[PDB]
Design a protein around this ligand. Structure first.
Ligand SMILES: CCCCCCCC/C=C/CCCCCCCC(=O)OC[C@H](O)CO
Ligand SMILES: CCCCCCCC/C=C\CCCCCCCC(=O)OC[C@H](O)CO
Ligand SMILES: CCCCCCCC/C=C\CCCCCCCC(=O)OC[C@H](O)CO
Ligand SMILES: CCCCCCCC/C=C\CCCCCCCC(=O)OC[C@H](O)CO
Ligand SMILES: CCCCCCCC/C=C\CCCCCCCC(=O)OC[C@H](O)CO
Ligand SMILES: CCCCCCCC/C=C\CCCCCCCC(=O)OC[C@H](O)CO
Lengths: 448, 448
């Protein structure tokens, strides 16, 4: 049955499934069978360690961030269940498994028609696409309309991999990889618009503050490792921790800033020989068609500036929640892994923390406002999974719940908040145009 | 008073309190302030990573071995509760918190009297000493005899660090570091005895099965990361796992071999700048004498040849437990991290798997035999700790329970099985003498 083979492939995990696809690719690409196996284990090993460092972030940064949002007594009554809550509900929609074949077909069609360079292999992040389908399925009522939302969500993020390819390769040091999925990509355009506005404003465009400039004026005390200690200290202190826990947490937050880059190094260390052999062999066929492998947004967290923004924005997002007019959602389950959101924002500004902070507040307010507009739909998906109990408490989430994609699609087929469609649609739509043009120039520069 | 502060120093953690001594010491050495901090934070990030990798061993390789041994639930009816069960029991003894100062004074007395060169800083593996003290206390019934065994265990392990210092540096890369604690060091003298016998036997002294010879024969299939996978497959199958869990475990068992060397490096990199300044200041003052810091035996699992021996010996220790004459103890808790028993054996044989295996079988049979002979005390160690019912189920452990140090101390003061006293003491006694000659020979080879 399709369901068993898909649920066996899904529950096989990136620990097993992705290396096989990596090993199969190199076995046909005339590589020594031993060399083909070596990369497969290293890609899987990195994902094992990736699950470990991410396990540390959500189990020691998370409970402290969750403690801040409660210690700051506000009125926000709806609690951000986070992507750890959104995906279980989403994988409980009827379109959950059927989306994965659909999303590859959209890839395979686009690959033959030279509409995308990304050959996505991460079949586990498709829950973001099912979320767009599930919420459209709730609001419109057409099985087709949910399915088309899967295709639109698939085709968009595929080009989001194309348009952020130099940013992934040159900034994050990921050659041959594109990061299509998750919050980093689909909130990437918003930061491409902020850095487009800022560059054209005099004086503002000359404000800089890169983390290297902290190290150029403080030395050991400006190193990424040191910052992870101090910010962890404050995240504990703002959470009321005793001096024992604040100290213990501050090393764990620092430990992210050293261990996380090291656990992603296995994947790059295994993908490199495969790419060089294939480029030696595919340049002579398709004609200079430099393909991109689609991978989890997790690898992006290997940047000292992304982690710095992540810990920095843990208090900021709670403050963005209060200030943002019309928000009713309290940051929670996505506070620990909140560096996912402002990830490509750092890549666009190329390290300027000044523009990162401006971008982050825009990104958070919008996603906090949008998630407030999707509280009704998000709760039905929770009811449609037996998720929330007899309390009837409202369910909201910042990952996929605060998605411009899932929102803007829903507000198109329903026409509830036309003003909301126009303001969000113009902002996001301009960002997509500016993100698309930024890649046009990049392709004419590298080539000539 | 003392008990509150002792817990506060103890509960603060190896991640928080060790940097404190390290940061204070660099300040004593007039090292830079920011440079003093940086070394301390890296040591914590080293120990954050150690707990994570040692967690994946316990939670994935663990339940794998607990399944294999469950086949023999019917012959061996006493279960090795391992060190994850022996440490909490030992921390509930009356001699627990009083053992920290007693061990430090014994080190201070031995350092001043120029009897040892180990400045132990692991106030956490003092429990191995308390276990020897506590079992003497249950057996003899003398509080004085309990404290003596702690000192004798302290004096032995402090000398163990000096006598196995070349191995911790030439074979493990831990310069200025000694590994006194742990099953590994105190069962190290047995491996020295096996090497002497074999090297005196013709032909058997010329059998080499090293990792480098494994690599040239096989290639990428003899690399450390590949080897952990192949055994990870076997460890899954022997536990009766499905085909997917076999595969998922196998990447994680190979991930151990790659991640663990990279989570101990920050401890090395943080201690290294302090070591050189200490040699600069303290060289002339202390007669040109080189000191060793005493840390955890988990930095020895950063050797890829030890992790291999930790997977190879999961079935063997089990199979040994069936044919060892008089063994009632089923290996269990200590199997997820069985490499902790043969760690210095890997360094004595210079990584020779042929001599590692021949030593490794010897050490397990002795410990399993001794762990059978210490069940009555171990069961009463649990009754006094509150970890017992009315079933009559018996407690045993190869970690500390199978210890020759606890056995020979208990068997010297009680004189129960004088036959067992003579047999274990003679082998251990010849072994310790060989281990002292090793240190005298190496020291005189440094003078030349
Ligand atoms: C730079 C290139 C990209 C630019 C991107 C610009 C985005 C424009 C806005 C989109 C939403 C438009 C909503 C239009 C609504 C039509 C009115 C309608 O249907 O009205 C029904 C309602 O009942 C009446 O009250
Ligand atoms: C722009 C690209 C359009 C591609 C349309 C694909 C729609 C459905 C695919 C069939 C999958 C069925 C399983
Ligand atoms: C162009 C062809 C469009 C239709 C492709 C097939 C329907 C897509 C998904 C299957 C869901 C149906 C259950
Ligand atoms: C009731 C069954 C409804 C099935 C609808 C399937 C629609 C699929 C693709 C639409 C075209 C892709 C854009
Ligand atoms: C030869 C080993 C070193 C020689 C010195 C050993 C000092 C022992 C310390 C305290 C015991 C007092 C226990 C009080 C209860
Ligand atoms: C290999 C090395 C061999 C030599 C190593 C040296 C061993 C002895 C040294 C110090 C501790 C002496 C014992 C001190 C015990 C004190 C007990 C005590 O104070 O007990 C009073 C109390 O009333 C009871 O309940």
């Amino acid at each position: 049955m399709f369901t068993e083979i898909m649920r066996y492939v899904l529950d096989l995990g990136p620990t097993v499934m992705l290396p096989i696809v990596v090993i199969l690719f190199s076995l046909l690409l005339k590589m020594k069978p031993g060399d083909a196996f070596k990369s497969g284990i290293h890609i899987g090993i990195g994902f094992v360690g990736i699950g470990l460092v991410i396990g540390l972030m959500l189990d020691s940064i998370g409970p402290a961030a969750k403690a801040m949002a409660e210690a700051f007594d506000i009125n926000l009554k709806v609690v951000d269940i986070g992507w750890p809550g959104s995906s279980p509900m989403t994988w409980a929609s009827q379109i959950a498994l059927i989306a994965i074949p659909i999303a590859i077909v959209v890839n395979l069609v686009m690959l033959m028609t030279r509409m995308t360079r990304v050959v996505n292999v991460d079949i586990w992040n498709i829950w973001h696409m099912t979320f767009t389908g599930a919420l459209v399925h709730i609001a419109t009522g057409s099985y087709a309309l949910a399915i088309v939302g899967v295709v639109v969500h698939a085709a968009f993020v595929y080009k989001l991999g194309d348009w952020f390819a130099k940013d992934t390769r040159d900034f994050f040091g990921l050659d041959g990889i594109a990061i299509p999925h998750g919050t980093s990509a689909y909130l990437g355009p918003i930061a491409v618009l902020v850095d487009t506005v800022i560059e054209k404003i005099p004086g503002l465009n000359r404000i800089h503050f890169s983390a290297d400039d902290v190290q150029k004026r403080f030395g050991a005390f400006g190193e990424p490792v040191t910052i992870g200690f101090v910010m962890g200290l404050v995240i504990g202190l703002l959470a009321g921790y005793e001096i024992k826990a604040v100290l213990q947490l501050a090393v764990k937050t620092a430990a992210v800033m050293l261990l996380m880059p090291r656990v992603i190094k296995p994947i790059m260390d295994g993908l490199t020989p495969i790419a060089k052999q294939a480029r030696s062999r595919l340049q002579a066929k398709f004609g200079g068609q430099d393909f991109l492998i689609g991978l989890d947004p997790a690898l992006l967290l290997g940047h000292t500036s992304v982690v710095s923004a992540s810990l920095i924005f843990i208090p900021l997002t709670i403050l963005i929640a209060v200030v943002t007019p019309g928000n009713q959602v309290l940051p929670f389950g996505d506070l620990a892994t909140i560096g996912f959101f402002v990830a490509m924002a750092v890549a666009v500004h190329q390290g300027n923390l000044f523009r990162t902070l401006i971008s982050g507040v825009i990104i958070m307010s919008i996603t906090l406002w949008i998630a407030t507009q999707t509280i009704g739909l998000h709760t039905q998906l929770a009811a449609n999974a037996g998720s929330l109990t007899g309390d009837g408490s409202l369910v909201a989430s910042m990952d996929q719940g605060g998605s411009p994609i899932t929102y803007l699609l829903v507000q198109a087929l329903t026409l509830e908040n036309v003003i909301g469609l126009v303001a969000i649609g113009a902002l996001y739509g301009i960002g997509i145009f500016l993100t698309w043009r930024r890649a046009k120039r990049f392709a004419a520069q590298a080539e000539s």
